[PDB]
Amino acid sequence: XXXXXXXXXXXXXXXXXXXXXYXXXXXXXXXXXXXXXXXXXXXXXXXXXXXXXXXXYXXXXXXXXXXXXX
Amino acid sequence: KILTERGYSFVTTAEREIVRDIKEKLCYVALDFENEMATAASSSSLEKSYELPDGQVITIGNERFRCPETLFQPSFIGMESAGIHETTYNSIMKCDIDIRKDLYANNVMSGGTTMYPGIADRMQKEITALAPSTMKIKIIAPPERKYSVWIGGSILASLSTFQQMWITKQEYDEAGPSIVHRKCF
């Protein structure tokens, strides 16, 4: 005969019960703007790299000093 | 065994021939050894910069001029024969007395080592040391020395007298290789 408390509470409840809507709204929306940094993890990477390769390590001494021998 | 001082270092045959180019380009003869060392202490114009045939630029000090001195002093790879010049004057003093002036005049050099600029000069310095200064001295240093031999050979080929002189197949038939050693010098 009506639209009621009973039905309004039904709608309210259903809203509360729907996990898909609210969880998707929070998680999927927040998922997209996720990331911006010059990561320190990559600072580690870079530093290690610096330590990594003979072309820096040996050559820095050997090209520089064996220039002048005598 | 020099080069490892600067210690860019490689040993194999092809690597050794790579040096030949440097021997073309980078060498020149020491005018005076002590004085050169003094300049070596003073200056880097003595030092020149050169590329790998491909790869690096390489730049070389006294190591260039030190090399020819071996001819004058074969200590550096060590032997005794008192060297080119002292050998020469020795071999002169073997040969007899009167001729000598001519040779003092007529002094001749050729080919691979001689290519270096300056050898004749220090040679003359050496002879002026060893000669009695009183008498004329000079040396010949033609441009073409490295070819000289084959050129002379061409001349040698030209004269008909070798038709008198050649070996022929016939002798090789009738007598062995032994033929040569009588027949040729």
UniProtKB/Swiss-Prot annotation, chain B:
Modifications the protein undergoes after translation, according to the UniProt entry: MICAL1 and MICAL2 produce the (R)-S-oxide form. The (R)-S-oxide form is reverted by MSRB1 and MSRB2, which promotes actin repolymerization.
S-S bridge residues: none
Q: Which domain of life is it from?
A: Eukaryota
Extract the ranges annotated as region (Interaction with alpha-actinin). 168-180
Spell out the subcellular localization from the entry: Cytoplasm, Cytoskeleton
Would you identify the family this protein belongs to, as annotated?
Belongs to the actin family.
The annotated subunit structure for this chain is:
Polymerization of globular actin (G-actin) leads to a structural filament (F-actin) in the form of a two-stranded helix. Each actin can bind to 4 others. Interacts with alpha-actinin. Identified in a complex composed of ACTA1, COBL, GSN AND TMSB4X. Interacts with TTID. Interacts (via its C-terminus) with USP25.
What does the further note read? In vertebrates 3 main groups of actin isoforms, alpha, beta and gamma have been identified. The alpha actins are found in muscle tissues and are a major constituent of the contractile apparatus. The beta and gamma actins coexist in most cell types as components of the cytoskeleton and as mediators of internal cell motility.
Q: What does this protein do?
A: Actins are highly conserved proteins that are involved in various types of cell motility and are ubiquitously expressed in all eukaryotic cells.
From the Swiss-Prot or TrEMBL record, give the protein name.
Answer: Actin, alpha skeletal muscle
